[PDB]
């Protein structure tokens, strides 16, 4: 037997959670139990605390999503049939190059600009929410600073590199296949993004995060029979499970982590993926305009 | 440098990253050395000076616990340095052979750490691993089979005992241990759930790590409705020893 | 030497082959028979790469490249100076990866733990084998394997992707990318959560798994728990790699080489629900 | 000792070891003489 | 020189030496076979 | 026999067999690499 | 200078020295084989 | 107390070590003389 | 790796192989009927 | 003003100050080096 | 605290200052030689 | 000024200072080597 | 100056110094070998 | 006392200094020969 | 009685039936509306 699923699932009362500091509001009281969630993990589906920052984040995000969707519906003459047919190919396209960094007409990038503004405000409000939800329980803010890296890549893609290029037209559209095409044409227009070194580093850290999380999940499942999944307790009071995990990796590759430093490895790999990504994007066009030429100049 | 120069902003930024990343690898490899150091030199090595490695272990780190208590890592008291083992050969890197009974010595796959002999208190300052008779409000969710009543059988097909109670973790609703009334000595021993196939293959629950009689030797918990971290390691280690040392003559 | 707690575990037994001949450690590393075999394969491969580079124009680390055989050799053994070195480096690499997984199995047995790590590594091994063995065999010549070069296998990825129009429209490829991005997200979340509980705000005690459950609830909406997170992470990474392998198997053996992945999607646009 | 061999056993093993090493070297030498008779290496600066 | 066997166990040292020697022989044979002058199977490229 | 005071043959034989088989496979593949000795 | 063996384990030092010397010799041989003037197998065009 | 050995062991190992190192260096010197006879290195700034 | 015993594995494998065999026999009868329609070997 | 060291421990304050000052100095030096007028190594007109 | 007595501190600091000063002297000689080889700091019109 | 060694462990401080000095020297050498005026190996061309 | 060995383990400091010296030596050798002027194997045309 | 005694430190340091000096003088001979082979430090116009 | 309701709680095995019936009616209406003959809004093309 291996711990991919739980053989016997016990069920009891709903947990209200840890009491908060005197700076928040009463949270929701949904606290329902889904059977399959408990099959693969825990079963409770609440209660989601949704305070001021969460509600304003959802409001701004749905303003942005409404703008995008209404523009995709208008671009198809309001036909729901043609909307379902063309959905993955529809997008709110960025402003035209002739407008630079001004506020263009609504049908030529004004709607795109407003949706991008509101999506950025939504994402910043969600970041503030993560920060407060961590520091309202007395925890560190490591999750918030991991989220800030993804936010930095998103800002570089949509805001910073368009700024430094002097045109909103550089930014992605709001659509599935159209933003894939934007990615492709961005690589094609700026040389070949395989010769962007920070792109190489971001790919190294993405592959390494996949590798590391496979390694770590497999390691914890392998020593779960010795209580390995209780990582905090195994760090505060080292048991035989984390000793066996450390010894597995030390005998395999010569070096190991502890119960806490493995999560520093994880955090740093996952964070360095979008950090190096954002650097490589900010460099692409304002600094280097042809990456293959740069690579030839170096190697 | 200037537009025509060989040096440019992209590669300067790349070297800045390489420096930062070498520093970060050093810092991470240094954090990795908060347990298990200094190294224990093996046969033929001078033991006067400590072996640490090129990132030396950092200073001991002090964690604050809930009840104002305090834990400093490395947990050197958990090491169990001297055990019942003898080198199979005089040269370095040689494996060790258990001198006595590896189930009782706690060596090899049967090793445990000298954890604190106190249960985990979770959040309300109460043991989190408790029998279901002691955690009112929880229930086995009859959607799955019920282990209680099923007599537990060894690896060699000998019945070992009968499942009496299911021990669960509070605040992480999960079954951790099955209590087992041993065969005919009126003694209750814990059985970790991952070491058991609670599926009712035929009629019962089967453990292939040890054989039927060995359930008498499982380390028993001192209290009756709570289990300490030390007993947890001892029980899981007694069951892990069978993965290498039992092989109950099933050939 | 040993970690301060390691001596308990350095016991004899648990190997697959060879008995106690290789049942020993060299410093930190356990050897076993498969450790000797892995170092043998890795070193023969590295020496063949070095020799192929000595025959080549440059020693530049970025421009080193061991190229697969010409398409004229099909699925046969090519002369050593005309692609055979690539085939032999591939054989050495697959041997090294397999004996590495087996050495991990031996270590798992000696420590008495599950075999999740060698099983998970087998997925990366399978993706590599798909790339260098399965796909070029299905397509009929070793010339479809990627060259062993730091920046020439990137050129191979580029050319292979662009040979199918835009590779982004490969559906299994979209699923694989979703899985990779979710794996990175979940790794950041898990690392940050455990680091938040262990290293809390100033003056605070080390937090418990209950706080972790609470904050995970407030972020993702529900809770998976301490074992659920590691299960989900293993599953996400493994499915990312599996769908990458599927992605590569379906492009060239299934969709023709000069095909178009963007055009394959017209089956949806051309449904009779909305086509005419 | 570190290996666990008494100097008697070490000397005994070393005798057979040097005997085998020297037989190996002699076989390698005749192999290299034959190989040279088939293809000499070490060309001139202009080539063979 | 016999003292070298007070340091290294002869079984494992001997097996490791054999693995090393076989790998070196394999590499030198490959290197010869990859050249044109010392390809004893097909001869020169001509 | 002196080699059999080391390397007890109950395990130093299957290793020799897999080594001989691997060497035979290597030489056959090297032969198939060439044109003069590719017997297919 | 014999005092160095009061610092370092002469056994581990011997193995490290062997590994390092072999790695260096292989590196130098491959460097020479990559040149044209000092390639001793095929000759002066490489 | 020292990092492992005694001055007797250290001196014995050092004697054997220096002998082996000297003969290794002598073989290397003969090798380099032969290599130079075959192909001198260090060309003039114009070439060979 | 997937929590499942050797009894379940063996019985599910028996089921899997008999299902595979039935699939293949229906496949070959479908092929011979198609040949009745179109012999694909001129 | 000495009371500032009742808020921030001098050790962290000092290491962060040093890394910040060195980063600023490096940035300014490279900014100057990128110009034509203030490039002191290769000089102007580039 | 670094776990160092003020006697140890003053000792280490004196040796450190001596070493830092010798390093500075060597670097100054190096820069004088480098300037004799190639002066930097051109005029605004170039070298 | 000797009091700085009460703030920082002289071992860690000294290792860090040496790493920093060597890295800075390497960087300055490579910068000079990348220029045309101060390349002392191949020269101005 | 001898007091620096009351701080740093001489074995570890010495193997660090040897690793660093070997790395610096091979780096300088490779740099010279990559230039045309100071290449001593093929010669000045490189 | 981070491992050693006063006497061991002094002995190690004497041996370290003498062997560092031997390394330095061998390297100086090496550089004199290298300069005899091909001088570096060209003029601002080349060699 | 039919115990498919016992396997499938009508609280969920009836809302899924309804979402499926709605999807099917939408699909059929869309198909008819896409044809030229059966379009009842801008009915016949050409
Ligand atoms: C011709 C000139 C003159 C010639 C000589 C003339 C005279 C001849 C006669 C006399 C001389 C001859 C005899 C000399 C005998 C010497 C014996 C000896 O030194 O034995 C040592 C010793 C003997 O055994 P022992 O007595 O038990 O040792 C006790 C010691 O106290 C060790 O205690 P510890 O265990 O506490 O310390 C361990 C420490 C020992 O090492 C250290 O203290 C430092 C190690 C890390 C150094 C990092 C780099 C620093 C410098 C950077 C500059 C470039 C580096 C190289 C770059 C190459 C490419 C350009 O190593 C580590 O902590 C692990 C390092 C892990 C590295 C992982 C990454 C490797 C690969 C990276 C690339 C891929 O054995 C070893 O140290 C074994 C390990 C050796 C390798 C170390 C790591 C190598 C790192 C490579 C570079 C990586 C970064 C790039
Ligand atoms: C390309 C050609 C090949 C190059 C290979 C690399 C060359 C440089 C390293 C050479 C080392 C030679 C050592 C010879 C034996 C010395 C005598 C001896 O055994 O004494 C006991 C000595 C130390 O015993 P100990 O004192 O008890 O160990 C605890 C430490 O002292 C203190 O504890 P700790 O926790 O601080 O450190 C434990 C751990 C330190 O951690 C590691 O060992 C980490 C090793 C991997 C580091 C990551 C490498 C990533 C490279 C990425 C490069 C990307 C570039 C391109 C990017 C685009 O191990 C060590 O202490 C160092 C062991 C050797 C490290 C290097 C192993 C091969 C790496 C190949 C790459 O043990 C060893 O040195 C281990 C020997 C076995 C490993 C060497 C053979 C590996 C063969 C690999 C083949 C395939 C390569 C690909
Ligand atoms: C370069 C070459 C030389 C260096 C080579 C070596 C590099 C590596 C060294 C070892 C690093 C070790 C490590 O990671 O320790 C983690 C470790 C984490 O904490 P812990 O020890 O586990 O436990 C702490 C407690 O649990 C209490 O925890 P907590 O509640 O305080 O929260 C802990 C949390 C945080 O710990 C902190 O210290 C951070 C918060 C500090 C207080 C609040 C200040 C807010 C300032 C906001 C500024 C925004 C931009 C930030 C840019 C940062 C980088 C410049 O820890 C972390 O997040 C880990 C550190 C890494 C953070 C990465 C942030 C990525 C940001 C991505 C872009 C975001 C864009 C904006 C998005 C905004 C939202 C939409 O320690 C630290 O984080 C302390 C170091 C913090 C460094 C801050 C930056 C210093 C450098 C400034 C720039 C200097 C250069 C340029 C100068 C100016 C030129 C003009
Ligand atoms: C212009 C170029 C000239 C030249 C000009 C110079 C000048 C100038 C100098 C040298 C110096 C050296 N030259 Mg020269 N040299 C040339 C050509 C060569 C060639 C060659 C194949 O052509 C070789 C092999 C050498 C070799 C050497 C060394 C003897 C010496 C380097 C110092 C040193 O070893 O520090 C390393 C010292 C150590 C103690 C390192 C010890 C390593 C220990 C054992 C542990 C390392 C562990 C290791 C990382 C493990 C992995 C190993 C890998 C598997 C390889 N030169 C050409 C002709 N040479 C230097 C010298 O003489 O210094 C005294 C010097 O100043
Ligand atoms: C032809 C295509 C080009 C290419 C063009 C690009 C471009 C352009 C970029 C990348 C980027 C990346 N590429 Mg690429 N890339 C290529 C080939 C590859 C290959 C391969 C095997 O060949 C791989 C593995 C990769 C992988 C990668 C990643 C390492 C990196 C993305 C980091 C990341 O995690 O973003 C995931 C994180 C984000 C996208 C930001 C997070 C978004 C925010 C925080 C979340 C908001 C959600 C929102 C609230 C939800 C509601 C919104 C509304 C519905 C709208 N590329 C080729 C060469 N690639 C990116 C990069 O950083 O490179 C420098 C990038 O910009
Ligand atoms: C370490 C880098 C990786 C990372 C990290 C990361 N992301 C994060 C976090 C962290 C640490 C959070 O804490 C935060 C969070 O809440 O996670 C649960 C988050 C988050 N990352 C998210 C998405 C996300 N992350 C991505 C990538 C990455 N995140 C990196 C690979 C991507 C990609 C690859 O495109 C996406 C789409 C959200 C789930 C969440 C931030 C939510 C937010 O800002 O909400 C704003 C509110 C609205 C816009 C209103 C509507 C909300 C819904 C539209 C939410 C739908 C979520 C998801 C299903 C969207 C998927 C894409 C859609 C187009 C379908
Ligand atoms: C004064 C100004 C200057 C200040 C503003 C300055 C701002 C700071 C600008 C910043 C903008 C930047 C940052 C944006 C970056 C762009 C992103 C990188 C987008 C890339 C990827 C986007 C797609 C993958 C997602 C598109 C959404 C989806 C396809 C459609 C959803 C809409 C419908 C379905 C809703 C159904 C709803 C219906 C209509 C039914 O009701
Ligand atoms: C939120 C993230 C952090 C905040 C933002 C970070 C950036 C803040 C500073 C931005 C400074 C402005 O940056 C400066 O932008 C201007 C116009 O926008 C660019 O100016 C030029 O850009 C390009 C150059 O081909 C052309 O469009 C045009 O000639 C001109 O606009 C500069 O090249 C860039 O250096
Ligand atoms: C004791 C050990 C004995 C080892 C004996 C060695 C057995 C032979 C090893 C198998 C070698 C087969 O070698 C190779 O096989 C493939 C697979 O069909 C043959 O067939 C291939 O032909 C052409 C190219 O040649 C391909 O385009 C085609 O798709 C494929 O059919 C190759 O033409 C042949 O060169
Ligand atoms: Fe974890």
mmCIF file of N, CA, C and O in Angstrom, chain A residues 7-13 15 201 205 226 229-230 233 236-240 244 255-258 260-261 265 294 297-298, chain B residues 5-6 8 29 32 35 61 63 71 75 78-79 109 111 115 120 137-141 144 174 176 198 229 232-233 236:
data_model
loop_
_atom_site.group_PDB
_atom_site.id
_atom_site.type_symbol
_atom_site.label_atom_id
_atom_site.label_comp_id
_atom_site.label_asym_id
_atom_site.label_seq_id
_atom_site.Cartn_x
_atom_site.Cartn_y
_atom_site.Cartn_z
ATOM 1 N N UNK A 7 -7.315 5.208 2.654
ATOM 2 C CA UNK A 7 -8.155 4.020 2.767
ATOM 3 C C UNK A 7 -9.402 4.309 3.593
ATOM 4 O O UNK A 7 -10.532 4.168 3.111
ATOM 5 N N UNK A 8 -9.212 4.713 4.845
ATOM 6 C CA UNK A 8 -10.300 5.003 5.769
ATOM 7 C C UNK A 8 -10.304 6.499 6.029
ATOM 8 O O UNK A 8 -9.291 7.065 6.455
ATOM 9 N N UNK A 9 -11.438 7.139 5.773
ATOM 10 C CA UNK A 9 -11.596 8.574 5.972
ATOM 11 C C UNK A 9 -12.544 8.798 7.140
ATOM 12 O O UNK A 9 -13.719 8.423 7.072
ATOM 13 N N UNK A 10 -12.038 9.400 8.206
ATOM 14 C CA UNK A 10 -12.876 9.752 9.344
ATOM 15 C C UNK A 10 -13.527 11.098 9.066
ATOM 16 O O UNK A 10 -13.014 11.913 8.291
ATOM 17 N N UNK A 11 -14.679 11.332 9.690
ATOM 18 C CA UNK A 11 -15.406 12.577 9.518
ATOM 19 C C UNK A 11 -15.903 13.069 10.866
ATOM 20 O O UNK A 11 -16.363 12.276 11.690
ATOM 21 N N UNK A 12 -15.806 14.377 11.084
ATOM 22 C CA UNK A 12 -16.217 14.975 12.331
ATOM 23 C C UNK A 12 -16.777 16.371 12.156
ATOM 24 O O UNK A 12 -17.299 16.729 11.097
ATOM 25 N N UNK A 13 -16.675 17.190 13.198
ATOM 26 C CA UNK A 13 -17.226 18.545 13.126
ATOM 27 C C UNK A 13 -16.430 19.420 12.171
ATOM 28 O O UNK A 13 -15.299 19.114 11.789
ATOM 29 N N UNK A 15 -14.312 22.689 11.364
ATOM 30 C CA UNK A 15 -13.389 23.548 12.090
ATOM 31 C C UNK A 15 -13.602 24.995 11.672
ATOM 32 O O UNK A 15 -13.585 25.314 10.479
ATOM 33 N N UNK A 201 17.206 30.978 -17.972
ATOM 34 C CA UNK A 201 17.194 30.816 -16.524
ATOM 35 C C UNK A 201 15.791 30.567 -16.001
ATOM 36 O O UNK A 201 15.597 29.755 -15.094
ATOM 37 N N UNK A 205 14.545 27.284 -13.989
ATOM 38 C CA UNK A 205 13.882 27.286 -12.691
ATOM 39 C C UNK A 205 12.476 26.709 -12.753
ATOM 40 O O UNK A 205 12.011 26.146 -11.764
ATOM 41 N N UNK A 226 6.046 6.700 8.207
ATOM 42 C CA UNK A 226 6.709 7.033 9.458
ATOM 43 C C UNK A 226 6.290 8.395 9.985
ATOM 44 O O UNK A 226 6.971 8.955 10.846
ATOM 45 N N UNK A 229 4.606 13.321 6.692
ATOM 46 C CA UNK A 229 3.839 14.452 6.185
ATOM 47 C C UNK A 229 3.681 15.561 7.214
ATOM 48 O O UNK A 229 3.313 16.678 6.841
ATOM 49 N N UNK A 230 3.945 15.287 8.489
ATOM 50 C CA UNK A 230 3.874 16.312 9.529
ATOM 51 C C UNK A 230 5.211 17.040 9.572
ATOM 52 O O UNK A 230 6.048 16.829 10.451
ATOM 53 N N UNK A 233 6.250 19.443 12.668
ATOM 54 C CA UNK A 233 6.629 18.706 13.863
ATOM 55 C C UNK A 233 7.928 17.949 13.654
ATOM 56 O O UNK A 233 8.737 17.828 14.579
ATOM 57 N N UNK A 236 10.584 20.665 14.189
ATOM 58 C CA UNK A 236 10.746 21.056 15.583
ATOM 59 C C UNK A 236 11.313 19.917 16.408
ATOM 60 O O UNK A 236 12.146 20.136 17.292
ATOM 61 N N UNK A 237 10.871 18.696 16.137
ATOM 62 C CA UNK A 237 11.341 17.516 16.854
ATOM 63 C C UNK A 237 11.592 16.433 15.812
ATOM 64 O O UNK A 237 10.665 15.729 15.406
ATOM 65 N N UNK A 238 12.843 16.305 15.387
ATOM 66 C CA UNK A 238 13.181 15.430 14.274
ATOM 67 C C UNK A 238 12.863 13.981 14.601
ATOM 68 O O UNK A 238 13.364 13.433 15.584
ATOM 69 N N UNK A 239 12.034 13.358 13.767
ATOM 70 C CA UNK A 239 11.725 11.953 13.888
ATOM 71 C C UNK A 239 12.495 11.112 12.889
ATOM 72 O O UNK A 239 13.345 11.595 12.143
ATOM 73 N N UNK A 240 12.188 9.816 12.887
ATOM 74 C CA UNK A 240 12.885 8.908 11.989
ATOM 75 C C UNK A 240 12.476 9.105 10.539
ATOM 76 O O UNK A 240 13.238 8.738 9.642
ATOM 77 N N UNK A 244 15.124 9.469 7.588
ATOM 78 C CA UNK A 244 15.170 8.563 6.449
ATOM 79 C C UNK A 244 15.137 9.321 5.133
ATOM 80 O O UNK A 244 15.801 8.927 4.174
ATOM 81 N N UNK A 255 24.050 14.981 -0.886
ATOM 82 C CA UNK A 255 23.656 16.083 -0.031
ATOM 83 C C UNK A 255 22.149 16.054 0.122
ATOM 84 O O UNK A 255 21.427 15.522 -0.721
ATOM 85 N N UNK A 256 21.684 16.622 1.226
ATOM 86 C CA UNK A 256 20.280 16.599 1.583
ATOM 87 C C UNK A 256 19.904 17.939 2.185
ATOM 88 O O UNK A 256 20.760 18.753 2.528
ATOM 89 N N UNK A 257 18.608 18.149 2.333
ATOM 90 C CA UNK A 257 18.057 19.286 3.041
ATOM 91 C C UNK A 257 17.546 18.833 4.402
ATOM 92 O O UNK A 257 17.681 17.674 4.789
ATOM 93 N N UNK A 258 16.966 19.765 5.136
ATOM 94 C CA UNK A 258 16.229 19.458 6.346
ATOM 95 C C UNK A 258 14.741 19.582 6.046
ATOM 96 O O UNK A 258 14.335 19.778 4.900
ATOM 97 N N UNK A 260 12.842 21.965 6.905
ATOM 98 C CA UNK A 260 12.531 23.349 6.594
ATOM 99 C C UNK A 260 13.282 23.868 5.379
ATOM 100 O O UNK A 260 12.697 24.571 4.557
ATOM 101 N N UNK A 261 14.560 23.528 5.233
ATOM 102 C CA UNK A 261 15.334 24.093 4.140
ATOM 103 C C UNK A 261 14.928 23.534 2.788
ATOM 104 O O UNK A 261 15.178 24.182 1.766
ATOM 105 N N UNK A 265 14.366 25.777 -0.563
ATOM 106 C CA UNK A 265 14.717 25.412 -1.931
ATOM 107 C C UNK A 265 13.518 25.554 -2.853
ATOM 108 O O UNK A 265 13.608 26.139 -3.939
ATOM 109 N N UNK A 294 22.499 38.891 -30.281
ATOM 110 C CA UNK A 294 23.214 38.955 -29.013
ATOM 111 C C UNK A 294 23.917 37.637 -28.717
ATOM 112 O O UNK A 294 25.087 37.613 -28.313
ATOM 113 N N UNK A 297 26.903 37.312 -30.783
ATOM 114 C CA UNK A 297 27.927 38.186 -30.227
ATOM 115 C C UNK A 297 28.611 37.559 -29.021
ATOM 116 O O UNK A 297 29.777 37.856 -28.746
ATOM 117 N N UNK A 298 27.920 36.687 -28.296
ATOM 118 C CA UNK A 298 28.537 36.004 -27.166
ATOM 119 C C UNK A 298 28.751 34.514 -27.397
ATOM 120 O O UNK A 298 29.876 34.033 -27.270
ATOM 121 N N UNK B 5 30.354 48.661 -27.745
ATOM 122 C CA UNK B 5 31.287 47.893 -26.939
ATOM 123 C C UNK B 5 30.850 46.438 -26.833
ATOM 124 O O UNK B 5 29.688 46.089 -27.052
ATOM 125 N N UNK B 6 31.808 45.578 -26.485
ATOM 126 C CA UNK B 6 31.478 44.173 -26.289
ATOM 127 C C UNK B 6 30.697 43.960 -25.004
ATOM 128 O O UNK B 6 29.901 43.022 -24.910
ATOM 129 N N UNK B 8 27.766 44.840 -22.465
ATOM 130 C CA UNK B 8 26.460 45.470 -22.560
ATOM 131 C C UNK B 8 25.602 45.076 -21.370
ATOM 132 O O UNK B 8 25.938 44.177 -20.598
ATOM 133 N N UNK B 29 22.467 25.792 0.836
ATOM 134 C CA UNK B 29 23.248 24.651 1.278
ATOM 135 C C UNK B 29 23.670 24.809 2.729
ATOM 136 O O UNK B 29 23.884 23.815 3.427
ATOM 137 N N UNK B 32 20.667 23.906 4.786
ATOM 138 C CA UNK B 32 20.534 22.454 4.764
ATOM 139 C C UNK B 32 21.277 21.780 5.906
ATOM 140 O O UNK B 32 20.997 20.616 6.207
ATOM 141 N N UNK B 35 20.633 20.174 10.620
ATOM 142 C CA UNK B 35 20.473 18.893 11.289
ATOM 143 C C UNK B 35 21.563 17.960 10.799
ATOM 144 O O UNK B 35 21.953 18.015 9.633
ATOM 145 N N UNK B 61 19.668 27.353 15.684
ATOM 146 C CA UNK B 61 18.494 28.184 15.480
ATOM 147 C C UNK B 61 17.476 27.905 16.569
ATOM 148 O O UNK B 61 17.224 26.749 16.910
ATOM 149 N N UNK B 63 13.687 28.179 17.905
ATOM 150 C CA UNK B 63 12.274 28.330 17.625
ATOM 151 C C UNK B 63 11.518 28.560 18.920
ATOM 152 O O UNK B 63 11.824 27.953 19.949
ATOM 153 N N UNK B 71 12.675 25.555 21.402
ATOM 154 C CA UNK B 71 13.397 24.418 20.855
ATOM 155 C C UNK B 71 14.550 24.915 20.007
ATOM 156 O O UNK B 71 14.345 25.705 19.086
ATOM 157 N N UNK B 75 18.682 19.085 16.685
ATOM 158 C CA UNK B 75 18.151 18.261 17.768
ATOM 159 C C UNK B 75 19.122 17.117 18.051
ATOM 160 O O UNK B 75 18.902 15.959 17.701
ATOM 161 N N UNK B 78 18.216 13.786 19.727
ATOM 162 C CA UNK B 78 17.423 12.824 18.977
ATOM 163 C C UNK B 78 18.276 11.831 18.205
ATOM 164 O O UNK B 78 17.723 10.938 17.558
ATOM 165 N N UNK B 79 19.602 11.951 18.273
ATOM 166 C CA UNK B 79 20.457 11.243 17.329
ATOM 167 C C UNK B 79 20.515 9.748 17.594
ATOM 168 O O UNK B 79 20.611 8.966 16.643
ATOM 169 N N UNK B 109 16.320 -0.283 8.956
ATOM 170 C CA UNK B 109 14.937 0.140 8.700
ATOM 171 C C UNK B 109 14.079 0.188 9.947
ATOM 172 O O UNK B 109 12.989 0.766 9.901
ATOM 173 N N UNK B 111 15.067 1.685 12.803
ATOM 174 C CA UNK B 111 15.582 2.725 13.674
ATOM 175 C C UNK B 111 14.514 3.765 13.973
ATOM 176 O O UNK B 111 13.581 3.973 13.195
ATOM 177 N N UNK B 115 12.810 11.013 20.135
ATOM 178 C CA UNK B 115 11.898 12.140 20.188
ATOM 179 C C UNK B 115 11.456 12.398 21.624
ATOM 180 O O UNK B 115 11.684 11.597 22.533
ATOM 181 N N UNK B 120 1.856 15.243 20.743
ATOM 182 C CA UNK B 120 1.670 16.513 20.058
ATOM 183 C C UNK B 120 0.378 17.158 20.533
ATOM 184 O O UNK B 120 -0.672 16.513 20.551
ATOM 185 N N UNK B 137 -17.604 13.585 18.594
ATOM 186 C CA UNK B 137 -17.961 14.412 17.462
ATOM 187 C C UNK B 137 -17.449 13.893 16.140
ATOM 188 O O UNK B 137 -17.879 14.387 15.092
ATOM 189 N N UNK B 138 -16.554 12.912 16.153
ATOM 190 C CA UNK B 138 -15.992 12.347 14.940
ATOM 191 C C UNK B 138 -16.507 10.931 14.739
ATOM 192 O O UNK B 138 -16.886 10.246 15.693
ATOM 193 N N UNK B 139 -16.518 10.497 13.483
ATOM 194 C CA UNK B 139 -17.099 9.215 13.124
ATOM 195 C C UNK B 139 -16.453 8.720 11.841
ATOM 196 O O UNK B 139 -15.987 9.508 11.016
ATOM 197 N N UNK B 140 -16.454 7.402 11.673
ATOM 198 C CA UNK B 140 -15.654 6.764 10.639
ATOM 199 C C UNK B 140 -16.186 6.968 9.226
ATOM 200 O O UNK B 140 -15.548 6.465 8.295
ATOM 201 N N UNK B 141 -17.303 7.683 9.032
ATOM 202 C CA UNK B 141 -17.801 7.948 7.684
ATOM 203 C C UNK B 141 -18.083 6.645 6.949
ATOM 204 O O UNK B 141 -17.294 6.241 6.088
ATOM 205 N N UNK B 144 -16.708 4.326 3.736
ATOM 206 C CA UNK B 144 -15.593 3.402 3.642
ATOM 207 C C UNK B 144 -15.778 2.244 4.618
ATOM 208 O O UNK B 144 -16.644 2.291 5.497
ATOM 209 N N UNK B 174 -8.297 12.290 10.107
ATOM 210 C CA UNK B 174 -7.522 11.255 9.443
ATOM 211 C C UNK B 174 -7.249 10.140 10.434
ATOM 212 O O UNK B 174 -6.918 10.406 11.589
ATOM 213 N N UNK B 176 -4.933 7.472 11.926
ATOM 214 C CA UNK B 176 -3.495 7.247 11.987
ATOM 215 C C UNK B 176 -3.127 5.859 12.490
ATOM 216 O O UNK B 176 -2.211 5.238 11.949
ATOM 217 N N UNK B 198 -6.205 -2.111 5.128
ATOM 218 C CA UNK B 198 -7.576 -2.132 5.653
ATOM 219 C C UNK B 198 -8.497 -1.999 4.447
ATOM 220 O O UNK B 198 -8.992 -0.928 4.091
ATOM 221 N N UNK B 229 5.281 11.224 20.934
ATOM 222 C CA UNK B 229 6.085 11.182 19.719
ATOM 223 C C UNK B 229 7.099 10.049 19.767
ATOM 224 O O UNK B 229 7.373 9.401 18.748
ATOM 225 N N UNK B 232 5.381 6.925 18.993
ATOM 226 C CA UNK B 232 5.064 6.932 17.571
ATOM 227 C C UNK B 232 6.246 6.444 16.744
ATOM 228 O O UNK B 232 6.099 5.548 15.899
ATOM 229 N N UNK B 233 7.428 7.030 16.957
ATOM 230 C CA UNK B 233 8.590 6.526 16.236
ATOM 231 C C UNK B 233 8.870 5.074 16.573
ATOM 232 O O UNK B 233 9.228 4.297 15.690
ATOM 233 N N UNK B 236 6.211 2.859 14.561
ATOM 234 C CA UNK B 236 6.492 2.848 13.130
ATOM 235 C C UNK B 236 7.834 2.197 12.828
ATOM 236 O O UNK B 236 7.992 1.572 11.778
#
